[PDB]
């Protein structure tokens, strides 16, 4: 068994401001994925870049103090790619793909479509390189993890105001229409193996108590391939855990080699 964690922490600084490092070590996963760190490796305190018993690796963006993604593994991946070899997704620091051995682990930062129809574009098309990136990848006969924050709740009970967003970003009908291909395409969402429930959600906004009033989103997820599902015995939700507005989310996958 093989414990990942998966986690938008919303600055990797900020969060360790908020007690990241007890619950990194309460938790003890085999390997913990970030997104949105908003640092490069420089700009870090020393005991945030090295974790006793980890290894860390950092995808920063071009531009310093933005969205940027983090890997730690106790055990280190024979490579990591850090593209799908398209530069204008490449460079913002969205994409991590590291090669154990059993298995690809994707962990993807996938773009906020709210600021406007250039970034909605944006969005879509980068659903698109990776579509093509983890297909290719999986048809040649790999074993896939894909983890991190789509910026999408797929269906109605995904979020709090289904209604209400109809119109917004995170919950258009191109949207969630690409995770219904996805999920075509031969994946499975492991949450919903396992949690059927509603009111299961890994993010709120800040303002106006949305937390402590539940309305939130769903737009973390774990994905695997579907040859590989048979491996996966959990896929859950942290919800407890407090220094974002994402909760972090878990999975455990048996294999040996
Ligand atoms: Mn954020
Ligand atoms: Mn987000």
């Known amino acids: 068994v093989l414990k990942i964690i998966s986690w938008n922490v919303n600055g990797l600084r900020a969060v360790h401001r908020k007690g990241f490092l007890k619950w990194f070590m309460e938790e003890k996963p085999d390997i913990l994925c970030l997104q949105e760190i908003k640092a490069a490796p420089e700009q870090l305190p020393r005991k945030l870049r090295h974790v006793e018993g980890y290894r860390s690796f950092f995808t920063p963006a071009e531009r310093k103090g933005y969205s940027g993604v983090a890997m730690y593994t106790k055990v280190p991946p024979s490579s990591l790619r850090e593209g799908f ?4 997704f490449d460079t913002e620091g969205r994409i991590q793909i590291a090669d154990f051995d ?15 129809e250039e970034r909605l574009k944006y969005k879509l098309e980068f659903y698109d390189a990776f579509l093509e990136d983890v297909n290719r990848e999986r048809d040649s006969g790999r074993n896939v993890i894909i983890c991190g924050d789509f910026n999408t709740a797929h269906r109605e009970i995904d979020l709090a105001r289904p209604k209400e967003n109809s119109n917004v970003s995170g919950f258009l009908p191109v949207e969630r229409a690409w995770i219904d291909k996805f999920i075509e ?13 509603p009111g299961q959600y890994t993010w709120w906004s800040y303002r106006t108590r949305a937390r402590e009033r539940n309305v939130g989103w769903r737009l973390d997820y ?5 040859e590989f ?24 996958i048996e294999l040996l080699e």
């Open 85 to 88: 070899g398209v530069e204008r």
């Open 222 to 226: 774990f994905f695997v391939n579907e």
């Open 185 to 197: 395409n031969g994946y499975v969402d492991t949450f919903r193996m396992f949690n059927s429930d």
């Open 102 to 116: 059993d298995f690809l682990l994707y962990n993807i930062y996938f773009p906020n479509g709210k600021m406007s």
């Open 229 to 252: 599902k048979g491996k996966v015995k959990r896929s859950w939700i942290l919800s407890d855990v407090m220094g974002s507005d994402h909760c972090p989310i878990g999975l455990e």
